[PDB]
């Protein structure tokens, strides 16, 4: 087929809050625990 | 020489129109064929 | 009627004779027998005189028909 | 180049007519590129053109023209061309010329043959402008030494005199009839308009240096004229001029009408042996007699 | 001729200078205009001067500019600027760089601030040279002041009004502050349902409170101040004629043989 | 002589070009002979593999041997490379494998002999190939670094190309004006003509991707956030699949950003792509920065990747992003609550105040991306109360719309439905 | 010539135009 | 909204058949 040559030139689906940072949600939950 | 580029002109136009009015008839008449 | 109007409508074009074969072709091929028989009187009429060759084309098949 | 006629558009908006001269002439020089943004102001264009002008009257008609050229709207277009009046300049290579030659002709067309089938006096008033536009592409016509086509342009605006002047004044005299006959019998419809460019055509034959007789009774059967038809066979007669009357008479009998035939017998009634003989030629008699021999 | 017309061109355009490097300025402008156009504006390819003169109108016209900045006349300023900003844009190669004309690019931005062409301002911006934009600070101010506005910070872009690259940023301040005040209403319009006196005040900076009454007196959505001013609360049945021409095109298109 | 016998291979494949040229050539008569005022394109289509596999001695042998019905223009292809529409079609081969060669300068020449013919035979069944010859022509300049006096020839092309009743011609010269606006950056000029003229509703899907792309671009930079959004993923889908490689990678790159515009997050998968990844990465990096609401970040990464930010241009839109950057926040602030108060906004936004978290709640309103309403008499921004979307008209407006299109669709192809004879 | 030639395709445009609008009538009738 | 999705795909397949048709019959002619 016609080609624009005019303009010059992990195997999963990921997501994107898999790449925000936090803490490890078993910390997360002794700090909560803790604190409550 | 004007009027002759005048004529060219309304011989494309209409030449065009002929054409596809052709092509749309000889369709018509393929389906009422049917 | 129709075999009637088809008949007329060769009287008015047989002026073109070239002309008419296109228009009534589309008729010759009709499940109306009267339509049929209007449209090759209305080929011969047009065509009179002049051995065109579609319009023995035309004729033809229709010479081979069921109805008489 | 410029890149930019907002420059140019505010030295129109001015009220200097000093200032807008100038304006409208580099307009008229960038419209080429520009009509984009000329567009919208061309408003103003039309303002400046409805006053008392000082050369804008002229100019800014020319301006105006193009800018809706380049838009589209050809309608609007014609008639500030129109407006521009001398500064058309017909006679140069340009597209927008061209192309508002061929929609002014397209116009005249259309008006002409509406308006010919209309009364005499409801006949709608033609512009003046328009009609010596149209007048000077005949006459570049004829000439180009393109008699020829001219004669067509003539049929389709519908004007006799001016058929008459090219098929006229041009070379194959002769020749130019016989086209002229072939499109009149054969495409054009209008039953009027065929009778009088007709009529037209055989005035031509007649004062030609040695008529075609022969076309001339073709077009008389056309129109139906027996009382003219019978003064032509009487003058050919009176005249030492057998075999053409004969030939006209075989013609009139193959082609007319009975009734026809029977109406110029009557007026050829109305030496005496041409006239009885004739007669009996166009009753038919010999004719009849000759196809049963062969 | 030619160089005869180019020295009385200086010869005024050196008079203007010094007299004011108002009326009668009105009318020295105007022989400049009429001097340029014996000679030429654009030379609009094909005439190709390549003249000091050329520079010398570009001059002409941004002192143009100038008197009709300082008398406030918004017609004649936005024609100097147009015609300004053909001449920088275009012949940038041909011309030598105005250090005289960043300013006036950053007042006519500042202008399309006021006048709500945002836009039209976003095009110029398009236009100007990217590095200058954060290196000047004629450009980059009014970039600045577009920020604020198109951000929200109404407060912060009535504090940052006192900042001023030069005094040729005059008027525009306050066409924008009206501006600002309609976006504030803007606001008031479609949303803050059941807004308050005191709080439509210190939102929406009119004059003293005994003006607060503008924008209500003019804009008057039906205000009807009762007491709170119910901010006039400003803010079922079938369509069926509308649905039945839709649905009978939808059977006609159904119908038509094509 | 492995050189020898690789030169009698690629002999071989030149004769099998030249039969491919010849198959062109022969349906090029064929359109012109009958009816159908096409299969030129059916010819053209292998145009960029045939410009792809072209060779100096191949065009050279075939301006030797072809060219032969009459006139002596081949003096002016002969020396470089030591009918209606036939001469046309070799000539733009012949001009491609010169722009190939790169000699931008008789490329030019041999271009205006090509465009003065097509000017001057006034035919309609060569607009396709006049069309293809105005890109190549647009190209060379570009080549040349010129692209100034295209800008009127090819706008007086266009005139009258939308004079004459054509559609292929008038997208291609349009698609080319715009493209030499933008390059030389008057997008005023470009969105003046694009209001003022029709692009052809039925045109090459190419040309029809063009034309959309551009379009968004002067949307996007006019502050028409949504029309240039839609518009852009329009283009990006009627883009071919497996090519056209950056043409795919700018449209991404423009419509990420005005996505995050809008107050949008773009789909990961764009990134993920493996086309695109490399070239998108900067945009993933604003993307996280943005997500993410950090101005640090949001700075660091713009200074870092300013290089492509002139390579692709969005300064203007990359702080019209900052401005969307504290829109997006307001956004989804509002989108994952019914009746936040504004002091949680505040808290929530980082704003400093929250009066002047109400502003900001106000200019959302402003740009409809929050859809809600507020009440400062006790202070807290209230939603509009969501209503369930079936007992109301909405779904017979969609429903309407797709209806509509697929009759549309229906009536296209059975006019389309042709019989040769 | 192109006057001529000009009259002739006018001729076949209306011509076609009044066929085609048969096609369409007598297609209805034989959906009937 | 179905029923006409269904009748413009059906459109759509025989006009690709009337396509491959022609082609084929073309091609055959001149060959």
Same mark, same amino acid.
Request: net charge positive; no cysteine; proline share 0%.
């Given at each position: 087929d016609d080609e624009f040559e005019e303009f010059p030139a992990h195997v999963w689906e990921d997501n994107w809050d898999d790449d925000n940072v936090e803490d490890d949600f078993s910390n997360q939950l002794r700090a909560e625990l803790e604190k409550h | 020489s004007g009027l002759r580029q005048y004529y060219l002109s309304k011989i494309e136009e209409l030449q065009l129109i002929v054409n596809d009015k052709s092509q749309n008839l000889r369709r018509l008449q393929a389906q009422r064929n049917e | 009627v129709r075999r009637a109007a088809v008949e007329s409508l060769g009287f008015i074009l047989f002026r073109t004779p070239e002309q008419c074969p296109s228009v009534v072709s589309l008729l010759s091929e009709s499940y109306n027998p009267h339509v049929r028989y209007g449209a090759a009187m209305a080929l011969g009429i047009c065509c009179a005189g002049t051995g065109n060759k579609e319009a023995i084309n035309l004729l033809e098949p229709m010479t081979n028909d069921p109805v008489n | 180049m410029i890149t930019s006629a907002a420059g140019i558009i505010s030295l129109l908006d001015e009220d200097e007519p000093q200032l807008k001269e100038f304006a409208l002439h580099k307009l008229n020089a960038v419209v080429n590129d520009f009509w984009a943004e000329i567009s919208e102001s061309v408003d103003k264009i039309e303002v400046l053109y409805e006053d008392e002008g000082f050369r804008s009257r002229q100019f800014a008609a020319l301006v105006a023209s193009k800018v809706f050229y380049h838009l589209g709207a050809f309608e609007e277009s014609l008639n500030y061309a129109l407006g521009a009046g001398d500064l058309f300049n017909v006679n140069d290579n340009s597209e927008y010329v061209e192309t508002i030659i061929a929609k002014c002709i397209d116009h005249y067309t259309k008006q002409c043959v509406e308006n010919a089938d209309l009364p005499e006096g409801e006949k709608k008033p033609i512009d003046q402008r328009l009609e010596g536009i149209v007048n000077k592409m005949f006459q570049r016509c004829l000439d180009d030494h393109k008699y020829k086509q001219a004669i067509g342009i003539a049929l389709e605006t519908r004007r006799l005199d001016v058929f008459e002047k090219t098929i006229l004044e041009s070379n194959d005299v002769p020749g130019m009839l016989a086209y002229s006959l072939k499109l009149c019998m054969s495409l054009m419809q209008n039953k009027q308009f065929r009778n009088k460019v007709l009529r037209v055509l055989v005035k031509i034959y007649m004062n030609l240096e040695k008529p075609d007789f022969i076309n001339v009774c073709q077009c008389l059967i056309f129109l139906d004229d027996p009382q003219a038809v019978s003064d032509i066979l009487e003058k050919l007669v009176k005249e030492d001029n057998l075999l053409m009357a004969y030939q006209i008479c075989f013609d009139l009998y193959e082609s007319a009408s009975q009734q026809f035939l029977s109406s110029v017998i009557q007026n050829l009634r109305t030496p005496k042996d041409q006239t009885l003989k004739m007669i009996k030629i166009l009753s038919g008699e010999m004719a009849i007699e000759l196809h049963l021999q062969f | 001729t030619s160089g005869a017309v180019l020295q009385a061109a200086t010869g005024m355009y050196e008079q203007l200078k010094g007299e004011w490097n108002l009326s009668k300025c009105g009318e020295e402008l105007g022989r400049l205009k009429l001097v340029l156009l014996e000679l030429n504006f654009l030379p609009t390819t094909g005439t190709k001067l390549t003249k000091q003169q050329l520079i010398l109108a570009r001059d002409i016209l941004e002192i143009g500019a100038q008197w009709s900045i300082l008398r406030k006349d918004i017609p004649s300023f936005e024609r100097y600027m147009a015609q300004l900003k053909c001449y920088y844009f275009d012949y940038k190669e041909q011309l030598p760089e105005s250090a005289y004309m960043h300013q006036l690019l950053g007042l006519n931005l500042l202008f399309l601030l006021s006048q709500n062409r945002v836009a039209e301002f976003h095009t110029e911006l398009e236009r100007l040279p990217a590095k200058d934009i954060q290196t000047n600070v004629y450009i980059k101010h009014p970039v600045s002041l577009e920020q604020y506005l198109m951000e929200g910070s109404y407060n912060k872009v009535f504090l940052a009004k006192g900042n001023i690259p030069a005094e040729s940023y005059t008027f525009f301040i306050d066409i924008l502050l009206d501006t600002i005040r309609d976006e504030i209403a803007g606001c008031i319009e479609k949303a803050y349902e059941k807004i308050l006196f005191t709080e439509a005040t210190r939102i929406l900076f009119f004059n003293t409170p005994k003006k607060m009454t503008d924008y209500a007196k003019k804009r008057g959505w039906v205000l009807g101040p009762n007491n709170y001013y119910s901010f006039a609360s400003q803010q079922t049945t079938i369509p069926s004629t509308e649905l039945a021409k839709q649905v009978i095109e939808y059977a006609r298109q159904l119908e038509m043989i094509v | 002589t492995a050189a020898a016998a690789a030169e009698h291979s690629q002999r071989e494949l030149d004769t099998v070009t030249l039969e491919d040229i010849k198959e062109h050539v022969k349906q090029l008569e064929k359109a012109v002979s009958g009816k159908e005022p096409r299969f030129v394109l059916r010819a053209l289509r292998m145009l960029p593999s045939t410009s792809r596999r072209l060779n100096h001695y191949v065009l050279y042998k075939a301006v030797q041997g072809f060219? #032969?019905? &009459? &006139?002596? #223009?081949?003096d002016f292809l002969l020396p470089f490379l030591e009918l209606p529409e036939v001469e046309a079609y070799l000539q733009l081969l012949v001009v491609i494998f010169m722009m190939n060669s790169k000699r931008y300068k008789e490329a030019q020449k041999i271009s205006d002999d090509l465009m003065q013919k097509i000017s001057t035979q006034n035919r309609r069944a060569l607009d396709l190939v006049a069309a293809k010859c105005y890109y190549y022509h647009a190209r060379v300049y570009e080549f040349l670094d010129k692209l100034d006096v295209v800008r009127s020839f090819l706008h007086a092309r266009l005139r009258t190309a939308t004079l004459r009743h054509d559609a292929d011609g008038q997208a291609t010269l349009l698609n080319l004006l715009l493209r030499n606006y933008l390059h030389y950056s008057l997008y005023d000029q470009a969105e003046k003509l694009v209001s003022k003229s029709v692009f052809p509703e039925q045109a090459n899907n190419n040309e029809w991707a063009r034309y959309l792309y551009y379009t968004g671009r002067i949307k996007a930079i006019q502050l028409e956030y949504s029309e240039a959004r839609r518009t852009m993923t329009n283009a990006l889908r009627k883009a071919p699949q497996h090519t056209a490689v950056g043409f795919k990678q700018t449209v991404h790159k423009l419509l990420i950003v005005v996505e995050l515009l809008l107050g949008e997050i773009p789909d990961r998968l764009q990134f993920r792509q493996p086309s695109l990844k490399r070239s998108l990465m900067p945009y993933f990096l604003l993307t996280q920065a943005v997500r993410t609401g950090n101005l640090a970040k949001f700075n660091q990464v713009l200074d870092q990747f300013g290089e492509k930010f002139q390579a692709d241009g969005t300064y203007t839109l990359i702080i019209r992003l900052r401005h969307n950057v504290i829109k997006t926040g307001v956004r989804m602030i509002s989108l994952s609550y019914s009746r936040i108060s504004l002091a949680d906004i505040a808290q929530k936004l980082q704003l400093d105040s929250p009066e002047d978290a109400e502003f900001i709640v106000a200019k959302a309103i402003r740009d409809g991306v929050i859809e809600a309403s507020i009440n400062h008499e006790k202070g807290y921004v209230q939603s509009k109360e969501m209503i369930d979307i079936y007992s109301t008209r909405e779904p017979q407006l969609a429903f309407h719309q797709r209806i509509s299109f697929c009759l549309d669709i229906h009536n296209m192809s059975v006019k389309a439905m042709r019989f040769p004879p | 010539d192109l006057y001529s030639r000009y009259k002739k395709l006018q001729q076949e445009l209306e011509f076609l135009e009044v066929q085609e609008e048969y096609i369409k009538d007598e297609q209805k009738n034989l959906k009937k | 909204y179905l029923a006409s999705l269904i009748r413009s795909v059906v459109a759509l397949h025989n006009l690709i058949n009337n396509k491959i048709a022609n082609r084929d019959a073309e091609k055959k002619e001149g060959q």
């Open positions: - | - | - | - | - | 060219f #032969t019905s &009459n &006139n002596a #223009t081949r | - | -």
